[PDB]
Design an enzyme around this catalytic site. Structure first.
Site, mmCIF file in Angstrom:
data_model
loop_
_atom_site.group_PDB
_atom_site.id
_atom_site.type_symbol
_atom_site.label_atom_id
_atom_site.label_comp_id
_atom_site.label_asym_id
_atom_site.label_seq_id
_atom_site.Cartn_x
_atom_site.Cartn_y
_atom_site.Cartn_z
ATOM 1 N N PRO A 39 0.816 -1.216 0.000
ATOM 2 C CA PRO A 39 0.000 0.000 0.000
ATOM 3 C C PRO A 39 0.852 1.270 0.000
ATOM 4 O O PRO A 39 2.036 1.231 0.335
ATOM 5 C CB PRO A 39 -0.880 -0.099 1.259
ATOM 6 C CG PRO A 39 -0.228 -1.160 2.131
ATOM 7 C CD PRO A 39 0.652 -2.007 1.231
ATOM 8 N N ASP A 40 0.218 2.386 -0.387
ATOM 9 C CA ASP A 40 0.873 3.676 -0.537
ATOM 10 C C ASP A 40 1.182 4.268 0.838
ATOM 11 O O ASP A 40 0.414 5.068 1.372
ATOM 12 C CB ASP A 40 0.042 4.621 -1.416
ATOM 13 C CG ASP A 40 0.683 5.987 -1.601
ATOM 14 O OD1 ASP A 40 1.793 6.192 -1.065
ATOM 15 O OD2 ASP A 40 0.069 6.838 -2.278
ATOM 16 N N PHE A 41 2.345 3.905 1.385
ATOM 17 C CA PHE A 41 2.709 4.300 2.736
ATOM 18 C C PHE A 41 2.997 5.799 2.810
ATOM 19 O O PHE A 41 2.876 6.402 3.875
ATOM 20 C CB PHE A 41 3.859 3.429 3.250
ATOM 21 C CG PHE A 41 3.583 1.943 3.268
ATOM 22 C CD1 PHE A 41 2.641 1.400 4.133
ATOM 23 C CD2 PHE A 41 4.277 1.079 2.428
ATOM 24 C CE1 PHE A 41 2.400 0.033 4.156
ATOM 25 C CE2 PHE A 41 4.035 -0.288 2.453
ATOM 26 C CZ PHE A 41 3.101 -0.807 3.320
ATOM 27 N N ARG A 42 3.352 6.395 1.665
ATOM 28 C CA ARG A 42 3.736 7.795 1.590
ATOM 29 C C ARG A 42 2.545 8.696 1.902
ATOM 30 O O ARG A 42 2.495 9.291 2.976
ATOM 31 C CB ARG A 42 4.293 8.137 0.204
ATOM 32 C CG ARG A 42 4.432 9.633 -0.044
ATOM 33 C CD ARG A 42 5.037 9.968 -1.391
ATOM 34 N NE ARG A 42 5.619 11.301 -1.382
ATOM 35 C CZ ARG A 42 6.500 11.743 -2.272
ATOM 36 N NH1 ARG A 42 6.910 10.954 -3.251
ATOM 37 N NH2 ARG A 42 6.972 12.974 -2.174
ATOM 38 N N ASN A 113 9.494 4.553 -5.563
ATOM 39 C CA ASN A 113 9.267 3.364 -4.750
ATOM 40 C C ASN A 113 10.594 2.780 -4.265
ATOM 41 O O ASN A 113 11.601 2.862 -4.963
ATOM 42 C CB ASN A 113 8.496 2.285 -5.515
ATOM 43 C CG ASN A 113 7.123 2.726 -5.981
ATOM 44 O OD1 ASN A 113 6.625 3.779 -5.582
ATOM 45 N ND2 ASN A 113 6.498 1.920 -6.827
ATOM 46 N N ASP A 115 10.540 -0.524 -3.071
ATOM 47 C CA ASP A 115 10.079 -1.891 -2.840
ATOM 48 C C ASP A 115 10.871 -2.929 -3.648
ATOM 49 O O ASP A 115 10.687 -4.131 -3.446
ATOM 50 C CB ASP A 115 8.564 -1.990 -3.053
ATOM 51 C CG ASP A 115 8.107 -1.521 -4.425
ATOM 52 O OD1 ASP A 115 8.856 -1.735 -5.397
ATOM 53 O OD2 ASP A 115 6.999 -0.945 -4.514
ATOM 54 N N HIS A 132 14.047 7.793 -4.277
ATOM 55 C CA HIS A 132 13.995 7.702 -2.822
ATOM 56 C C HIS A 132 14.853 6.547 -2.304
ATOM 57 O O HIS A 132 14.683 6.127 -1.163
ATOM 58 C CB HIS A 132 12.546 7.551 -2.327
ATOM 59 C CG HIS A 132 11.687 8.754 -2.528
ATOM 60 N ND1 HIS A 132 12.211 10.023 -2.701
ATOM 61 C CD2 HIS A 132 10.344 8.896 -2.538
ATOM 62 C CE1 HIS A 132 11.227 10.891 -2.840
ATOM 63 N NE2 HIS A 132 10.070 10.222 -2.745
HETATM 64 C C1 8K9 Z 1 9.981 -4.039 4.326
HETATM 65 C C2 8K9 Z 1 8.819 -4.018 3.360
HETATM 66 C C3 8K9 Z 1 9.077 -3.163 2.119
HETATM 67 C C4 8K9 Z 1 10.546 -3.205 1.674
HETATM 68 C C5 8K9 Z 1 8.217 -3.728 0.990
HETATM 69 C C6 8K9 Z 1 8.705 -1.721 2.382
HETATM 70 C C7 8K9 Z 1 8.022 -1.017 1.391
HETATM 71 C C8 8K9 Z 1 7.670 0.315 1.576
HETATM 72 C C9 8K9 Z 1 8.007 0.980 2.757
HETATM 73 O O1 8K9 Z 1 7.647 2.294 2.881
HETATM 74 C C10 8K9 Z 1 7.262 3.075 1.748
HETATM 75 C C11 8K9 Z 1 7.419 4.548 2.096
HETATM 76 O O2 8K9 Z 1 6.423 5.257 1.353
HETATM 77 C C12 8K9 Z 1 8.837 4.998 1.714
HETATM 78 N N1 8K9 Z 1 9.222 6.366 2.110
HETATM 79 C C13 8K9 Z 1 10.699 6.455 2.082
HETATM 80 C C14 8K9 Z 1 11.231 7.790 2.631
HETATM 81 C C15 8K9 Z 1 10.613 8.125 3.993
HETATM 82 C C16 8K9 Z 1 9.090 8.108 3.867
HETATM 83 C C17 8K9 Z 1 8.683 6.698 3.444
HETATM 84 C C18 8K9 Z 1 8.711 9.147 2.875
HETATM 85 C C19 8K9 Z 1 7.481 9.796 2.982
HETATM 86 C C20 8K9 Z 1 7.127 10.790 2.074
HETATM 87 C C21 8K9 Z 1 7.987 11.161 1.044
HETATM 88 C C22 8K9 Z 1 9.223 10.526 0.922
HETATM 89 O O3 8K9 Z 1 10.018 10.852 0.015
HETATM 90 N N2 8K9 Z 1 9.604 9.515 1.831
HETATM 91 C C23 8K9 Z 1 10.935 8.907 1.634
HETATM 92 C C24 8K9 Z 1 8.754 0.255 3.835
HETATM 93 C C25 8K9 Z 1 9.170 0.889 5.161
HETATM 94 C C26 8K9 Z 1 10.184 0.003 5.879
HETATM 95 C C27 8K9 Z 1 9.848 2.240 4.962
HETATM 96 C C28 8K9 Z 1 7.972 0.956 6.117
HETATM 97 C C29 8K9 Z 1 6.902 1.968 5.755
HETATM 98 C C30 8K9 Z 1 9.073 -1.080 3.579
#
Ligand code: 8K9
Ligand code: ZN
Length: 288
Positions: A39-42, A113, A115, A132
């Protein structure tokens, strides 16, 4: 200059099949990985930043802030364990980009991404700009060491709930992602200049463009470069789909997979694409 005959998916397809369209750049965001169970964690809507209560952070964003991470890495790795996916299976959209590569049409995929799904789908380092960073590799944070660790090592540490530490110098080992307070990779800025000269088409997929760094990127490609958006939502970036002055921008609204399948169809690549997804998914199943 007018390069698309019509501002439709058909017109984009037609342009892609012409001798004019040699170099395609993809810009991809979290929307291309949602159907893979990432899912879109951002984006704030997802509410990731509400499940963090139990980590008793000073503020929710601290979990991704570099200075906080260095002092208190445990929440980040706990969260990583929590959300680690059962499998890493690239989507139809990922495999569409693999087709572009193998047909020699892909200049570059710029991805937001982390991922690794682009790499698993067969896009190579040269093909990729990980804006990123990535979970694919990790490094000791010490500048005089920088011992490299593969995801297999990092995953084991994540599953054992042992904070990653360098076997050599005892420093924290960090996934090669760009934390808050870290700068974008030098690769990003350098590739941008050169790429955005040579580009014949921009394929923007699973990103709203309301958000950096793609908002800027899009607005400084050559004015005549056609741009197709495949996204569930409407687009920043300064795109013009709708006005009487629209000349080069095309929007397909819906899931990225379905958009890619529709585009593949018109190119006559649908079977090849469906076969590739099936085959590569089976390969992953066999080795997982
Ligand atoms: C381990 C499962 C995996 C690899 C599959 C996965 C996949 C996605 C993951 O996170 C996706 C985030 O959207 C990545 N962002 C990277 C960085 C910091 C955050 C988060 C952010 C927010 C807004 C803008 C921005 O540029 N950024 C850059 C995550 C985690 C570990 C970082 C846990 C959340 C893990
Ligand atoms: Zn070290």
């Amino acid at each position: 200059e007018r390069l698309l005959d019509e501002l439709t998916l058909e017109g984009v397809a037609r342009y892609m099949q012409s001798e004019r369209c040699r170099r395609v750049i993809c810009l991809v965001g979290a929307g291309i990985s949602t159907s893979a169970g990432i899912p879109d964690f951002r984006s704030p809507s997802t509410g990731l930043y509400d499940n963090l209560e139990k980590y008793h952070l000073p503020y929710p964003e601290a979990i991704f802030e570099i200075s906080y991470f260095k002092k208190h890495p445990e929440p980040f790795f706990a969260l990583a364990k929590e959300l680690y996916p059962g499998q890493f299976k690239p989507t139809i959209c990922h495999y569409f980009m693999r087709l572009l590569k193998d047909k020699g049409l892909l200049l570059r995929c710029y991805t937001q991404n982390i991922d690794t799904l682009e790499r698993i789908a067969g896009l190579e380092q040269e093909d990729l700009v990980e804006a990123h960073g990535t979970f694919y590799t990790s490094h000791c944070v010490s500048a005089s060491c920088r011992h490299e660790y593969p995801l297999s090592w990092m995953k084991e540490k994540i599953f054992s709930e042992v904070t990653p530490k360098c076997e050599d110098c005892q420093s924290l080992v960090k996934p090669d992602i760009v934390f808050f307070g870290e700068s974008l990779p030098a690769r990003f800025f350098s590739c941008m200049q050169s790429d955005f000269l040579k580009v014949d088409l921009l394929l923007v997929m699973g990103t709203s463009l309301q958000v950096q760094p793609f908002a800027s990127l899009i607005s400084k490609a050559p004015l005549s470069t056609p741009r197709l958006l495949i996204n569930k939502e409407k687009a920043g970036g300064g795109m013009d789909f709708d006005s009487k002055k629209a000349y080069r921008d095309v929007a397909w609204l819906g899931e990225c997979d379905q958009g890619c399948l529709a585009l593949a169809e018109l190119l006559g690549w649908k079977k090849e694409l469906e076969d590739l997804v099936r085959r590569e998914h089976a390969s992953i199943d066999a080795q997982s």
